């Protein structure tokens, strides 16, 4: 059989900024930049600069069960090839730096200035990845600095970052008196898994957290309070539930059917008189177009 998507041909991830200012009753809250006066064009309420973010970056970590096999790579990055000391050879906008120290065949990239509005995609070195972990990081948090210790980030995910918050939680009106909300450099973290070489699925976490919070006379949390496949379609809805978990799990089948892995960050709505903002960080499928009759003879359907 001839012309299916196999093994070899290139996988994308995208990341997408999405999120559109809420107007409250007169301030305009953008997890991404803190609280505005106005919009379009943006100018920041006063001390908003002491609070809020003005850098993010990805840093994207991938595991292969073997050496990348591909011998060749392309003028703007979608291929790439390994030399014989072990560094990667791609071109184009992002480059991978072999990291022995984490373990055989893992590589790293960071892709930073992820601004307003922006798309940002990158091609992984093999569609037959053991893992992809994906580290989201804002600045002006105290972890910020570090965030290169990959040892350090996985200890905060393991131990330290929430999974779940309760409703009365997000009720809470955090006190003028906490001078520093303590929410984390790392917003969001992503992972791929695949169980073999051969797998033809792909499995995802997500472990969501907040956006920098802001003390104006009293304070505004950000809440990245949902996300997964799907979870775009529910936009403008927080759902009344005792618990909201702060993870994702799932699984998409038939991989060689997908071109690429989307994130998606956009703003929902706030609750707790404003002072509590939702955020879904959506992450779905973008599948090759394929009829009925190739999907059934690739074995895809």
Not at 2 to 13: A, D, M, Q
Not at 108 to 134: A, H, M
Not at 147 to 156: A, H, Q
Request: net charge neutral; aromatic share 14%.
């Amino acid at each position: 059989i001839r012309g299916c998507p196999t093994l070899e041909t290139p996988l994308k991830l995208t990341f997408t900024e999405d999120i559109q200012p809420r107007k409250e009753n007169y301030f305009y809250y953008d997890g991404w930049r803190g609280v505005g006066q106005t919009v379009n064009p943006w100018s920041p309420v006063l001390d908003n600069h002491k609070y809020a973010a003005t850098e993010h970056e990805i840093h994207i970590y991938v595991e292969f069960f073997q050496t990348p096999s591909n011998r060749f790579a392309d003028k703007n990055g979608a291929y790439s090839y390994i030399d014989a000391n072990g560094v990667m050879y791609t071109n184009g906008e992002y480059s991978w730096e072999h990291v022995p120290a984490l373990g055989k065949n893992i590589y790293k990239v960071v892709i930073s200035d992820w601004n307003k509005g922006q798309t940002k995609s990158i091609y992984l070195p093999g569609r037959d990845f053991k893992t992809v972990e994906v580290f989201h990081f804002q600045n002006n948090r105290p972890q910020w600095d570090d965030r290169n210790s990959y040892e350090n980030v996985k200890s905060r995910i393991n131990n330290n970052i929430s999974k779940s918050y309760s409703k009365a939680k997000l009720n809470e009106q955090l006190s003028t008196y906490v001078h520093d909300d303590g929410t984390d450099s790392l917003f969001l973290y992503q992972k791929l898994s695949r169980a073999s070489l051969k797998e033809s699925q792909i499995n995802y976490y997500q472990l969501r957290g907040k956006f920098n919070g802001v003390n104006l006379g009293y304070w505004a949390q950000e809440y990245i309070l949902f996300g997964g496949e799907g979870a775009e379609q529910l936009k403008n809805k927080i759902p009344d539930m005792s618990n909201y978990s702060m993870e994702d799990n799932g699984s998409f089948k038939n991989a060689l059917k997908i071109e690429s892995l989307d994130l998606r960050l956009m703003d929902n709505n706030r609750m707790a008189y404003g002072s509590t903002g939702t955020y879904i960080a959506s992450f779905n499928r973008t599948d090759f177009s394929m009829t009925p009759e190739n999907l059934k003879a690739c074995g895809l359907d």
